């Protein structure tokens, strides 16, 4: 619920207009993720990654 | 007559708008109004009388 406060501190923000209260604000929003986001993660661009070279096979266009 | 105008009722409003007019434009959070508010006054090393 971070943008919600993003919704009401601009809606009485006092004309800031540091982009580093604005740029740390933002990233306070999303939160860490830690000890599995590593690997799931790492999974995930696995099945990413992995379906090209699946996809890699078969080139009669690509002979070369 | 001033308490009449008084907005609040609890001390955590009190210290968020005191929080807010000294770091506008980011959000409260309690420990770090609190901190704030004895480090401006209580804290030794950041006020002195002499």
Do not use: H, W
């Given at each position: 619920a971070?943008?919600?406060?993003l919704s009401?501190?601009?809606?009485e923000?006092?004309?800031?207009?540091?982009?580093?209260?604005?740029?740390?604000?933002?990233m306070?929003?999303v939160?860490?993720?830690?000890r599995?986001?590593?690997?799931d993660?790492a999974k995930?661009?696995?099945?990413?990654?992995?379906?090209?070279?699946c996809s890699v096979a078969?080139?009669?266009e690509a002979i070369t | 007559?001033?308490?009449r105008?008084?907005?609040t009722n609890?001390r955590?409003?009190a210290?968020?708008?005191?929080?807010?007019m000294?770091?506008?434009?980011?959000?409260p959070?309690?420990?770090?109004?609190?901190?704030?508010?004895?480090?401006?006054?209580?804290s030794?090393?950041?006020?002195?009388?002499?």
């Amino acid at each position: 619920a971070a943008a919600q406060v993003l919704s009401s501190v601009e809606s009485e923000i006092g004309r800031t207009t540091d982009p580093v209260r604005m740029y740390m604000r933002e990233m306070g929003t999303v939160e860490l993720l830690t000890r599995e986001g590593e690997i799931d993660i790492a999974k995930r661009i696995e099945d990413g990654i992995n379906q090209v070279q699946c996809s890699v096979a078969e080139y009669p266009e690509a002979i070369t | 007559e001033t308490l009449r105008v008084d907005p609040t009722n609890d001390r955590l409003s009190a210290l968020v708008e005191i929080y807010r007019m000294m770091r506008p434009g980011e959000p409260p959070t309690r420990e770090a109004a609190e901190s704030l508010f004895e480090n401006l006054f209580f804290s030794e090393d950041r006020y002195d009388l002499s």
